[model samples]
Target: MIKRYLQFVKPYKYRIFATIIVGIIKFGIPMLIPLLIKYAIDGVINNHALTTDEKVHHLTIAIGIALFIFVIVRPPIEFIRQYLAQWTSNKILYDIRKKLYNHLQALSARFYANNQVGQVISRVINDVEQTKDFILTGLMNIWLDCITIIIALSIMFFLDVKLTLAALFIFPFYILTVYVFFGRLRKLTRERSQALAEVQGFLHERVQGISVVKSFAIEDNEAKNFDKKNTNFLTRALKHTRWNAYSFAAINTVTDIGPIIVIGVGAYLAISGSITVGTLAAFVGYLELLFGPLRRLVASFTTLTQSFASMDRVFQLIDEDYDIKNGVGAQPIEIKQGRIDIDHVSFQYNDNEAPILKDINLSIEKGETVAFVGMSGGGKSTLINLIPRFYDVTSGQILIDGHNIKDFLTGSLRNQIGLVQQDNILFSDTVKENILLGRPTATDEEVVEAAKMANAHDFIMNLPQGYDTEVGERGVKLSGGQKQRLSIARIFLNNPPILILDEATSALDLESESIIQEALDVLSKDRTTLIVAHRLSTITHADKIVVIENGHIVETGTHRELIAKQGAYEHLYSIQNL
Candidate 1:
């Protein structure tokens, strides 16, 4: 599992190496302090032949060196160690986040149909940060501390092997304690994270629907639902915290055990005159240095386990395969005529369920305005969506301009089609920016012209910032009519040969509908336009009217022909008095 994640670290190997080296120097400086203490105790203060003045002179030199190492040299080394470690970890995170975002965008519409935005955000943003902790604690700190422990033990062995043995005899217990505590901690950490993500997902979903809840007078009901998830998260978090505290207590106890034994044995040797007092004191100092890293190593296990769980989620998203992608040897589409053919196409969102569209067939000629009319849940929207290749057909084919859509690059295929739905998406940005999304390279003058053609120029100019005015999230600040006009403006700027208006005027009032219908009439001229119309009166003059029912084209003809036939289209038309 770690093998795959380690690939992200390979590019920053040089920075990692530098961080490790500086970390060693930072730790190495502290190791020398014990030796200085040993020198002051034996070589200067306890020297048999030395006078008091000589002792003071040697001790002063030792203190000055100790102060110099701690105050001046250690600060810069510590700074480099921290800075380099962060640089490497953050760079890796940046690469991971960018890759995950691009991968999400590459995924087909079906992936989003079954996923929550909050879950993706949790994995991409929160889980990626957890991987950084792994680099710092599991990779850098653990490695450096282990090395520091070895150096401390080596110096202690040089001072007196017997004292070193006493300190190490209880070391296995420390390892065992950490192993047991962290074993449970690892599982607890994973569960806690999952619960937290669940809570976050619920919170995000509910907040986005706050207006609906408030309008329906269900605020109290929503709060109760939120409390259920919040309590579940708190319950898991408390369990994790309990185990973490237990691990800390056990590790700290085991850490102190080694030092206690060392001090007891060293004091006996000092009293027996077999070793000097300075040697005993140095043993005590070295044991502190040795056990410090031992304690830290235990603590790092927590970070390691959490990161392991987080990296699993991160890599899972990274490795997720695309359901819809361009075929091999696919080339950019070359459009000569805006013709579309649905050659016995069938699509089901899942295999276990029935197909939403089943073996439907239709052909549309170049520069024709075809309107699809149907009751709700009749697959009118789903059929139109397949034209843009949002979701590929489950079986059979859709051809455009005498070529299979799958044979062309999906991005290039979509570029030739313009879509404006009833709920037209307008990003939270300036009006000019939203319009420019149609053609980012379009000039200001071109944007104005497109907006004018959509009957949106006068209203846009009336806004506080005119073309530069901000459209709040999903164009919340704009009226339904205004938002629809802006979408039409985008389609105009795009200048695609094919246009899809999926009930674009269905949600507007009669006055708004009349104004937008005029714009749509102008926009649809000489273009291969496909419309899914809920209002039957609007498409009476369509070159062709396709009546779909239960994922099948029940009737197809001009509006007058369908009306005269008195079939499904005539029945729907009579209901609306057309």
Candidate 2:
């Protein structure tokens, strides 16, 4: 997965090349500064067989030139290096973020049901941000640090072979220190990331359901539960900090001793006349420059480990296979008569769980209005959901126009069916856009026509911006009746052959129900309609009413016949009245 990163960065090839070019330039300049120092000490400051007057004049010119190169010329080069790195990193960020979001949109609904919104958001947003640091800092620094170390080491060897050999003594400790602490730091950091994601997930869920919390006066109770989750995150974060502390202490100690060894050996070489005072000063400068990159390179490794932790999270999501797969012979459905047949079908959410629906068989002719009325958990909604292939049957099959529904791709199957649920959902968009969501290519005139058919046009027109009004989050700005009407208007624009109403009006007041029902009555006139009714009055005149009990159809007839026989439908209707 980490190897796949080249795709987003590939678009901006020149900027990355520039970072390399500038890295070479900056590295060469610094290496030469130490050489120049060697010249200054040997020729001007050391005990030389020259006059003091000549040495003073020569030393003053050399020092000013060195200061000018560092203070004036180098800053702009550093600026260019940083600028190119960040400028290029941001472009890759946009492409990668867009790719992640698009993949999320294609994922099946089951993926969402199992994962929390906050957790997914963390992968998409937080994880993406962290991973960008790989290009922003990690990649360039790795390249430049390599050049810095190789060049620094070569210079050390050139000056004196034995003193350079002494510098190697502490190198083994650097490797050993990093190896010992790497695994522990990575594990702790990964734990901290997951703990933080859990907090975000719960925070989003509760905030969205703030009304429910307030309704039950459970703010204090919920806050206590949140406190425990927050506390766990704090503990996980501190552990990561603790690991970094120990790891740094050990690694830094090794680097700290490198200069000590170099100077100790250098003093003996100077005393023995094998090396001069100028040579000793140059060696010390070279030693400092060499280990400086080594220290930072290790620090960069630790920084990248965070991005790697975040990368692991994002790819895990990207690699998941969809629960619903579209395979061979799947295409846009060749829907003919809109007939439906459920053949000995059964469904269970899990293998160990009891079936939500069992051995069910049913048929509906085109243009027939059928209603399924039963106790809350008796599977009316589940049965309707199966028609759209929302959840596939565990056994047997469903056929539409004599073809197994699974033979048709999921999107094509849904294209011919429209559904309105008890909890009507809408995007926070203009009225026209929400209606247009049913069919985006819809003309403005067609949009107006759909609202009129759902009896929504007049109420929509009364709002401050009418069809252009911004419906607040989940359409909270709209009344229940208005929200349901907009939902129905979407179906009207969809104009599918089959329509499903899952207790669409149960939550509305009596007045809103009557108004919405008037529109639904018209909407159902020519479609193959299915209604899961909670208030029995709405389906009394249906052509067929199925009465279900405990995942089985106990009785089926017209409403009047079921009431007269005084069976399951009658019992349910009587209790609803009470």
Candidate 3:
């Protein structure tokens, strides 16, 4: 796990190494206190040959150096260690998030349709944060504690070898206790994190659909469901905490036993004249330093294992295989005319399901206005969506200007088409910013012209801040008609060669519909246009009207021609009139 996640770590090697070095200096300085105590007790005050004045002089110098090391030297190095660790860990997280976000964008629309938005968000946000914390507490701290313990132990052995050997006698039992507690804690920690993610997922779903909850009068039921999930998370967290507490209690009890052995043996040796009082005192102090890190070792190991589970989740998202990608040697297309041809196209969500669209064929000329009308679930919208390559056809070809769409760079292909669906989304930003989504490079004057063309300029100027007025989330602050106009204005700024309108004006009142219809008329001129409308009246003037039923084109021709035939189009128009 460490080896795999090291890719993110490798970039910050220098800062990490510097943090480790400074951390060593910070921990190493504390060990000096024990040696200074021994020197004061044995060399100055307890020395028989030393005069009173000499002892006083020696003690003053020793005290000054101790204060300097603890106060002045430690603080600055401590700051550097903490700052470097934070900077390095956060920088790695930034890079990981950037990679994950880019991958999410590259994935096909099918991937999103199959996954929950909340679960995907948990992986990107929660899992990535856990991975960074592992770098902070698990990766750097383990080495810092281990090296400090080694150095402290080396000094203990040098001061009195026999006493040092006695202190290590209880170390094996401590290791055994850590091993026993580790297995249970690791499992509980993983379960706890998964439970938390479930709670987050449920909350996201309920909040996003709060309107439905209120309409159905099921707010009480929704709250109960949320509580059930929250309770499950609490249960898992407590189980983890119970085992965690046990590990700390057992490890700490075992750690206290080490000092007993050191003191018992050192006291006997001191009485027998085998070791001095100063040496025994210094050894006791050093035992405290050694045990402190030894106790923390168990915690660092547990945290490292928990973080490994999070790392697995983070990498799982990064490693996901996306269905849509720019083909090898794909180049920008040269579209001289906005002609399109659909040849026997078929598509299905998956192999296990029946196809949504069957072997369908159509030809649309440059600057032609084509309209597709049908009952819901008749595959009219699916066929239109295929033209933009939102999902590739299961078995056939869609050509633009005689060139296969797959042969052209995906971005280059999408760049030439303007799409405005029935439900258009405006990001939570200023009205001007949302309009700029179509052409970010457009000047302010150009933006106003585009809005004027869409008939959105008057309403926008009436707003509190006009172009700068913030459109709340998904344009919740605006009416449905206003949102649709803003979407059309965006396309006006884009001015693409090909345009797609999927029931774009179907959600408006008669007055608003007529106003938007006029804007659509201007936007569709001299461009290859495709429309999917349930209202038959909107498409009466269309150059060609195609009626789809159960994934097949049931009727195709001008509205007048279809009316003369008195087939599917005539029946639909007759029903709408009634």
Candidate 4:
């Protein structure tokens, strides 16, 4: 955790050092105020040599100068310190967020398949906010308070060494109490943060699937589950609050006790004429000054520890390795013709699991439309995902245009392939923006052309804003078929050499599917297209149909030829038809 917190400072070392300098200046100015108070108390307040009028005039001038300095210098110095610290912290947080997002994008599909969307969202938002809070507020407070405490202590000792040594007697107890409470507070804070994240995950899942909950009438069940998580969060939060309150109260008590000890010892020395009344009064003033910084230092320590815990969680996520990394010597792939081959290929998600694809060998020539038909969990989608290097084969090889796919950079390889999945993922943006996502630099004419090809332009024109219409979150404002058509428009805009349609029309009604399929037929021509679907009728026109069972290819032939063979393909077709 300490190492991770330090990493946020690595890129901004110079700026941080400058901020620390400003903090020192800010602390040093207040430390000087205490000495001024001591001087006024010892030289003027207790001295009988000066007349009343002379003392009043002298004190007025001294206070006026102090007020002038405070008005002129302190605000600007504080502003500079705060602005620089916050600006640098925000920049570092931005860089950290960018690195995390980029790294996640490069990770294998298997990682995403297993992780919840809500958990990932919480990590990015809540965890990053925690890290920023530590970096900006917690770190700055610690540094400033330390400097203030040290300066205050030095002035206290200089004013009167005897009184300072007497106060030091209570220092060990103060340290012990603070250390114990801070450790306990840090543990409780970490538990509280984890519980909050779990609650966020639960809320996000329930909200996204509200329709399912309502249909099942399980609102009470979800409410009960939420209450359990919420109660755990409350318990941990209360414990953390108790530790913080106890530490602050204990420090305040210790601070108050120091003055009593000082007064007792100072009075004895003054009674024996060993120390003057003026000196004793100055000692009391300095002790009061010392108390403020001491309390702040203890509180700062607790905040710093909690921030460190949050930083540790953020760093753990940022350091996760990308499983589908590009190979050494990888370069961009140039495709003259789209042809793909999976030769003796095998893969397993992890080392412990059985292979999901075993000894799979298949070939796809240019401009051929092949369909993969299978039962659920038959590895059809997994096979299509592999073409874009979503996951690397555990054994053998996948070749594109007669060259090994591993030989090309994953990004460059994926640029040549267009994939549309069962879910038509859309962002909260204009209809035009979502479709143009595939080619951000595409011209207006090109975008319209793609939309027309997807059969989306006609419906889009009837909307309030036409192509400029803003789609709500996940295109919730649009029907399922409209979202799917918009997604197809995006793929059309990409204009890749190869296409993978994984139940792209599954969400559409029969009439809509017929209309979209006509568009797809046009889009698939002169391009290598692979289709995976549960509906047997949809892929009847495919040049070749491959039936997969378990992890292996059970049959492969033209649709008519497979039906005639009376094998796995025929059985699945008959079942779907009935």
What TM-score do all the candidates reach, one by one? 0.89, 0.88, 0.89, 0.86
TM-score of 4: 0.86
User: Could you give candidate 1's per-residue lDDT for residues 406-513 as a string of tens digits?
Assistant: 887887888899888666899999999999999999999999999998778989999999999999987888987888788888999999989998987855788767
Candidate 2 TM-score versus the reference: 0.88
- Each prediction's total of clashing residue pairs, residues at least 3 apart in sequence or on different chains, is 0, 0, 0, 0
Q: Write the per-residue lDDT of candidate 4 for residues 453-483, one digit (tens) a residue.
A: 8888989999999999999886889988899
The deviation in Å at residue 223 for candidate 3 is 0.5
Among the numbered candidates, top lDDT falls to 3
lDDT for 530 in candidate 2 is: 91
- lDDT of each candidate versus the true structure: 0.85, 0.84, 0.86, 0.83
Tens digit of per-residue lDDT, candidate 2, span 368-397: 899998889899988888888877889989
lDDT of 1 at 338: 88
Query: Which pairs of residues collide in model 1?
Result: none
Per-residue error at 74 for model 1, in Å?
3.3
lDDT of 2: 0.84
